[PDB]
Amino acid sequence: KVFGRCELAAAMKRHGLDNYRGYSLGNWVCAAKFESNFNTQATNRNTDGSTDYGILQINSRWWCNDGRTPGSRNLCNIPCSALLSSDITASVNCAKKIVSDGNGMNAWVAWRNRCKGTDVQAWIRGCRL
Ligand code: NA
């Protein structure tokens, strides 16, 4: 499923991401736009043999099991295919674990390089929230 901007803002708010760990909804919407172009089915192979999955491009090196990332962890306790669902629940639950420790939203390269420090509130402009 390819979400619209305001459609994804509404889904992320319902699933409890607005101000999760102090990150406003616009940060999450911006991160999804530049990680996946709002596409739940997005996948990208990494140099280390891991793969990034779904609307927030969550990696199999740490977060999910895809059966082809030897020596990796599964800290979200899910198959990576769960991150490609039209339903964003599994991606949101896993994103909440990722953001809660380590480097916060810096874990998302597209967020750090394309959203951090910008007017991220613009990403929710015009949305019925
Ligand atoms: Na893994």
Swiss-Prot record:
Residues covered by the C-type lysozyme domain: 1-129
Enzyme nomenclature, EC number: 3.2.1.17
Function: Lysozymes have primarily a bacteriolytic function; those in tissues and body fluids are associated with the monocyte-macrophage system and enhance the activity of immunoagents. Has bacteriolytic activity against M.luteus.
Miscellaneous comment in the UniProt entry for this protein: Lysozyme C is capable of both hydrolysis and transglycosylation; it also shows a slight esterase activity. It acts rapidly on both peptide-substituted and unsubstituted peptidoglycan, and slowly on chitin oligosaccharides.
Gene Ontology MF terms in the entry: beta-N-acetylglucosaminidase activity; identical protein binding; lysozyme activity
Catalytic activity: Hydrolysis of (1->4)-beta-linkages between N-acetylmuramic acid and N-acetyl-D-glucosamine residues in a peptidoglycan and between N-acetyl-D-glucosamine residues in chitodextrins
Origin: domain of life: Eukaryota
GO terms for biological process, alphabetical: cell wall macromolecule catabolic process; defense response to bacterium; defense response to Gram-negative bacterium; defense response to Gram-positive bacterium; killing of cells of another organism
Species assigned in the record: Gallus gallus (Chicken)
Annotated keywords: Allergen, Antimicrobial, Bacteriolytic enzyme, Disulfide bond, Glycosidase, Hydrolase, Secreted, Signal
Disulfide bonds: C6-C127, C30-C115, C64-C80, C76-C94
Hydrolase in keyword set: yes
EC category name: hydrolase
Cell location: Secreted
Tissue specificity note: In the egg white and polymorphonuclear leukocytes.
Record Gene3D superfamilies: 1.10.530.10
Active-site annotation: E35, D52
Recorded family membership: Belongs to the glycosyl hydrolase 22 family.
Keyword set includes Ribonucleoprotein: no
Short name of one Pfam family: Lys
Name of the protein in question: Lysozyme C
Gene Ontology cellular component annotations, sorted alphabetically: cytoplasm; endoplasmic reticulum; extracellular space
SMART domains the UniProt entry points to: LYZ1
